[PDB]
Write a protein that binds this DNA or RNA. Structure first.
Lengths: 112, 120, 50, 215, 121
RNA sequence: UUGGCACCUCGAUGUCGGCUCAUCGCAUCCUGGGGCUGUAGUCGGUCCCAAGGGUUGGGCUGUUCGCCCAUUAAAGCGGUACGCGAGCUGGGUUCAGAACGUCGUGAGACAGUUCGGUCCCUAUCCGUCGUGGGCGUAGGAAAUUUGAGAGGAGCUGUCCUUAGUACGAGAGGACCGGGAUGGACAUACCUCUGGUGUACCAGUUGUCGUGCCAACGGCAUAGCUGGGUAGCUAUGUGUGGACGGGAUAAGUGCUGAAAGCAUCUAAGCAUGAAGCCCCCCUCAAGAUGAGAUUUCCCAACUUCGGUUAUAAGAUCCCUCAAAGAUGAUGAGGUUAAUAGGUUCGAGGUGGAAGCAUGGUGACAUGUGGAGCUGACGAAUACUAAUCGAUCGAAGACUUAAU
């Protein structure tokens, strides 16, 4: 629609790189818990990417102490300081939903 | 977006049969509910026949049917050969609207209103 | 389930009030001269001239 | 106290100062003009009349509501305005600060940020009792024959009848609803829009009215 | 965990290894519970030398769930299993260690000690 | 409640316990307002006024009961053919089989147990929940409205401060006041997190076809498997029960006599409840008591004290939806963007065909942010809404004052 794109254009960001599913990112997230500002990282694999405008979202999965953890963040959130892409992976589909049931040698993905 | 009182497996075959019968005869009689949906199905087969590329010739073969037309007698051109041929060379300058519907009134014994669909 | 009382003639004729038939939409054809249903094709001649 | 009419557009989201995610509703109010003013000595009460959208002019052969008819033109020419699709009264706004022919702009809503929206709901048609009144179903197994059917409607001849107000199947939706104590996010005068926090009733192209919070 | 008969895993360091929920505290008629709420459970499995024997009735707190948690920033965190810890009646743990990550909603709950012994928050 | 009586029903008024949906009484379980204490405080006892709203989830028995586990501000008691079988369950109790204990010479019986064992009906009338057509409202029409009168909603916990203050020898620990967040229950909505998505994309097994290769089609639950737009959706996202006004109940009263003192009362003034009437939300002039406002139309006649056809408007028919069982409602009908095509987009799928190159081959890379695409947003009369028809006003009589 043309009236919803002119009222939400003032919230899009350009400091964002390009990343496909399967790629490993390093999301820097601002955390104000405690007394004031502080930054904590999160390194995982991209398994989902929903479409839209200022409503686009992405999901990153990591395994911690033997328990997998998934984080979903709105792409245009102001609570992200940086997004670094390290490893690019070859995949055959957009949604890597089969990664949850796997673990170990089976879970790792090949590099282009 | 119509079902025509049929299952998904029969609503597809009957549409493939109605689209091929028209390209051969160029004028057929049916009911109003079948004419408004076959309308959009036949208007897209002519769009493929106006591009000419081989990729388009293979996508039209998925909906078309194997039928011979002896009237022409020039090797009994198949229904798919008539398209990309006689039919593709008539609507070159026309962009959309290749069919026309005409009403005839209810039919005895069933009450359904007969219609005439033809290629412009 | 079953009717307790039979229906009288007075009651039966009031329910059938709206049980009527419709008059079709017909006009004289420009060329045929006979009557024709609007938006249809003249059976007598075959012309529509849309 | 203020009021204005508009049309729904859709749902979206915006980011706050601290990163808070806030869903919003897009509404458009472009052409609002005052047509009449009622008073105590005439018409009994105080209120004003407002049109929201512009219809076409009068033609000798009009067969749709798009063109205005003669009765609707004279009532509009009296205020020097063109035919309007929607007209509604506002008995809460003041009557001494408005003159006939005035234009109602969106920028009139500022520093209020608290309003109530009134509109018609979508509409579902003929529905059952489990979905219209949110009742419970019967057991789906164990040799049962009671699933989506309604329960007992009476009490065995103590009263040989059904009381007024029993919940039965029927047509639901299409009623006037009002959501109270909503907030205005921002107003873009460049496009004649109003970002409302939350959601409003009706389809995405229905008529909505906005007035100052009554509470 | 969430409902009356849900089975959770014990993440803390004690004898208890598996607990079955018995009740969700807070209000009359509460249905489910999520991270940061106390529940009443019963022990089903345990270690031969633990401190919590098999068949007891204690209180615990939810630290990991599969449903996840939504934040005011529009972001979601989900886990792969459900776990809790047997806590004393003063919000203190009954063990000396804590296994696995934990949610940061525990800090709001005022369970300060549990956050300290967690490997990842 | 267990009985007494035998007045209605034996050409027939179907049981116990549930389930689903409720209603109503107050002899009040919780919440609100008050006396008196053998009432220090925190907590209680008992009694009065109050029916607005609330008043859990499981284990064991066919059950009611009853006991137990864990909670809650509280887990109140009664009526309606012990509410309810043309609404539904059949576990117990009254069918035909068989067995045990007991009784009988016997056929068989329980003052007792055990396993098994068909619940049927297309709604005529009243009643109830939705939705249309007529006529009326003293000319015929199009919009916006007043509200007589009805309906809906009414609940409550834990923390923080006042204040570790009042009280008490200490342990303990507040009272109308100010803030912050929950439970349950209503309601609107699909941006977000999920489900569905049989005319969307991709992978794959067997077999039969398009003559063969390649590429495709039919049938095997939609053959199966991995994703998914619109729409509809809760477990998801917002909001709500918020402040005040006017008269009262039980209470405390202020003046004041009958009765030189006393006394809330017999005249005269106050104060005082989640309850009463308003405030909040929805429907409402068939409210025959049929209301009000703005605007539109108002001529030709044998001079029936009437009539015709039109006028402003509304339909027939046709293209559609945000509406919908049908109808009604809403958008439009070429003096036109209503729908379908066509040309660009968003979203989904994730790398088409052909050809070239590298391998004995199964396959891989390149051409290439490929190809395809139902419902969503724009532009465009190419196709179909043709030509036409029908309905629809000339405004009664009385006073009173002009």
């Amino acid at each position: 629609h043309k009236l919803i794109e002119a009222v939400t254009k003032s919230q899009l960001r350009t400091d964002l790189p390009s990343f496909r599913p399967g790629d490993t990112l390093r999301v820097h997230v601002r955390i104000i818990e405690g007394t004031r500002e502080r930054i904590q990282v999160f390194e995982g694999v991209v398994i989902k990417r929903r479409g839209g405008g200022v409503s686009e979202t992405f999901t990153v999965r990591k395994i911690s102490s033997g328990v997998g953890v998934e984080r979903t963040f709105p792409l245009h959130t102001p609570k992200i300081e940086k997004i670094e892409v390290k490893r690019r992976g070859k995949v055959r589909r957009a949604k890597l939903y089969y990664l949850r049931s796997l673990r170990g040698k089976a879970a790792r993905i090949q590099e282009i | 977006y119509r079902k025509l009182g049929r299952t998904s497996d029969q609503r597809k075959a009957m549409l493939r049969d109605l689209a091929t019968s028209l390209i051969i005869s160029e004028r057929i009689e049916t009911t109003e509910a079948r004419a408004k949906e076959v309308r959009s199905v036949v208007e897209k087969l002519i769009t493929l026949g106006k591009k000419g590329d081989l990729a388009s010739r293979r996508n039209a073969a998925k909906t078309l049917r194997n039928v011979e037309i002896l009237n022409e007698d020039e090797t009994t051109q198949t229904a798919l050969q008539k398209l990309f041929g006689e039919i593709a060379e008539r609507y070159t300058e026309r962009q959309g609207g290749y069919t026309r519907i005409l009403k005839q009134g209810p039919r005895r014994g069933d009450g359904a209103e007969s219609v005439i669909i033809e290629l412009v | 389930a079953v009717p307790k009382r039979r229906t009288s003639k007075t009651r039966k004729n009031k329910r059938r009030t709206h049980f009527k038939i419709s008059v079709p939409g017909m006009t004289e054809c420009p060329n045929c001269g006979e009557y024709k249903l609007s938006h249809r094709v003249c059976k007598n001649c075959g012309s529509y001239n849309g | 106290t203020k009021g204005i009419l508009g049309r729904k557009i859709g749902m979206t989201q915006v980011f706050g100062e601290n990163g808070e995610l806030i869903p919003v509703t897009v509404v458009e109010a472009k052409e609002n003009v005052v047509l009449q003013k009622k008073t105590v000595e005439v018409d009994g009460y105080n209120a004003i009349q407002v049109g929201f959208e512009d219809k076409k002019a009068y033609k000798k052969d009009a067969k749709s509501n798009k063109y205005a008819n003669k009765p609707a033109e004279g009532h509009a020419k009296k205020a020097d305005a063109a035919p309007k699709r929607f007209i509604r009264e506002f008995r809460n706004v003041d009557v001494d600060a408005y003159e006939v022919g005035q234009e109602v702009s969106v920028d009139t809503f500022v520093a209020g940020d608290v309003i109530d929206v009134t509109g018609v709901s979508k509409g579902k048609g003929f529905q059952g009792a489990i979905k219209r009144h949110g009742q419970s179903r019967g057991p789906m197994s164990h040799g049962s024959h009671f699933h989506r059917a309604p329960g007992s409607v009476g009490m065995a001849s103590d009263a040989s009848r059904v009381f007024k107000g029993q919940k039965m199947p029927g047509r639901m939706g299409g009623n006037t609803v009002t959501v109270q104590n909503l907030e205005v996010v921002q107003v873009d005068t460049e496009n004649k829009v109003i970002l409302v926090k939350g959601n409003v009733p009706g389809p995405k192209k229905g008529l909505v009215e906005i007035r100052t919070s009554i509470k | 965990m969430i409902q009356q008969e849900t089975r959770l895993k014990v993440a803390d360091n004690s004898g208890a290894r598996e607990v079955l929920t018995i009740k969700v505290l807070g209000g009359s008629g509460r249905k489910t519970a999520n991270i940061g709420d106390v529940i009443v459970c019963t022990v089903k499995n345990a270690t031969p030398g633990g401190v919590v024997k098999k068949g007891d009735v204690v209180k615990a707190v939810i630290v990991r769930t599969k449903s996840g948690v939504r934040r005011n920033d529009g972001s979601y965190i989900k886990f792969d299993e459900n776990a809790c810890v047997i806590i004393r009646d003063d919000k203190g743990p009954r063990g000396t260690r804590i296994f696995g990550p934990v949610a940061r909603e525990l800090r709001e709950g005022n369970f300060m000690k549990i956050v300290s012994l967690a490997p990842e928050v």
